[PDB]
């Protein structure tokens, strides 16, 4: 905002039908340039959040991705906790036998 | 039996889970961001076009004909430097790309 107005302080719009000259193309394509530049970067900042916020979402992917990996895991240990819970009873029948 | 069910889940859990980011290139994040680069790459064209005809300006082609002089081997070799940077810097934003 302060760049920009110290722009316009410097050059008084518009179309230079006062400020003495003709209409400018110069002068006039000199503004157009300067918001564009402001722009540009200010957009540059925005993207860089995308970017950062982007990262972020990708590396929470990966946490999701482990998380869920070991509980797969998990389940499938419990899993194998009531099968040796079973040979267990078929030993002890071998026991009683 | 069931236990090694138990691990297919686990394991289907991991390839749909990568299906997701797999046939995919791009988050959300990431075109948004991306796509800010880009028209901040047209921004930079904007202000490319801008400075060149600044500088064509300060310096009016070509060979200084009329241009109160001789042929200017260090003026028009500043013309070629500063068409060197800005196209060494367009360059730089593509290669970042």
Same mark, same amino acid.
């Given at each position: 905002?302060?760049?920009?107005?110290?722009?316009?302080?410097?050059?008084?719009?518009?179309?230079?039908?006062?400020?003495?000259?003709?209409? #400018?193309?110069? =002068?006039? +394509? $000199?503004?157009?340039?300067?918001?564009?530049?402001?722009?540009?970067?200010?957009?540059?900042? !925005? /993207?860089?959040?995308?970017?950062?916020?982007?990262?972020?979402?990708?590396?929470?992917?990966?946490?999701?991705?482990? #998380?869920?990996? =070991?509980? +797969? $895991?998990?389940?499938?240990?419990?899993?194998?906790?009531?099968?040796?819970?079973?040979?267990? !009873? /078929?030993?002890?029948?071998?026991?009683?036998? | 039996?069931?236990?090694?069910?138990?691990?297919?889940?686990?394991?289907?859990?991991?390839?749909?889970?990568?299906?997701?980011?797999?046939?995919?290139?791009?988050?959300?994040?990431?075109?948004?961001?991306?796509?800010?680069?880009?028209?901040?790459?047209?921004?930079?064209?904007?202000?490319?076009?801008?400075?060149?005809?600044?500088?064509?300006?300060?310096?009016?082609?070509?060979?200084?004909?009329?241009?109160?002089?001789?042929?200017?081997?260090?003026?028009?070799?500043?013309?070629?430097?500063?068409?060197?940077?800005?196209?060494?810097?367009?360059?730089?934003?593509?290669?970042?790309?």
């Amino acid at each position: 905002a302060s760049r920009l107005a110290g722009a316009a302080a410097d050059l008084v719009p518009n179309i230079f039908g006062f400020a003495g000259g003709g209409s #400018r193309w110069g =002068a006039i +394509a $000199e503004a157009t340039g300067y918001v564009m530049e402001f722009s540009a970067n200010v957009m540059n900042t !925005e /993207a860089d959040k995308i970017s950062q916020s982007e990262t972020y979402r990708r590396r929470r992917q990966e946490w999701e991705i482990q #998380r869920n990996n =070991a509980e +797969a $895991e998990l389940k499938q240990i419990d899993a194998q906790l009531k099968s040796l819970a079973v040979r267990r !009873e /078929a030993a002890v029948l071998q026991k009683t036998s | 039996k069931t236990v090694l069910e138990k691990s297919k889940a686990g394991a289907q859990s991991r390839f749909d889970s990568y299906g997701k980011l797999y046939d995919e290139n791009i988050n959300a994040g990431e075109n948004q961001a991306m796509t800010l680069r880009a028209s901040a790459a047209g921004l930079t064209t904007a202000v490319q076009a801008s400075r060149l005809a600044g500088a064509a300006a300060d310096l009016v082609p070509n060979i200084f004909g009329f241009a109160g002089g001789g042929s200017r081997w260090g003026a028009i070799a500043e013309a070629t430097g500063y068409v060197m940077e800005f196209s060494a810097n367009v360059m730089n934003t593509e290669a970042d790309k």
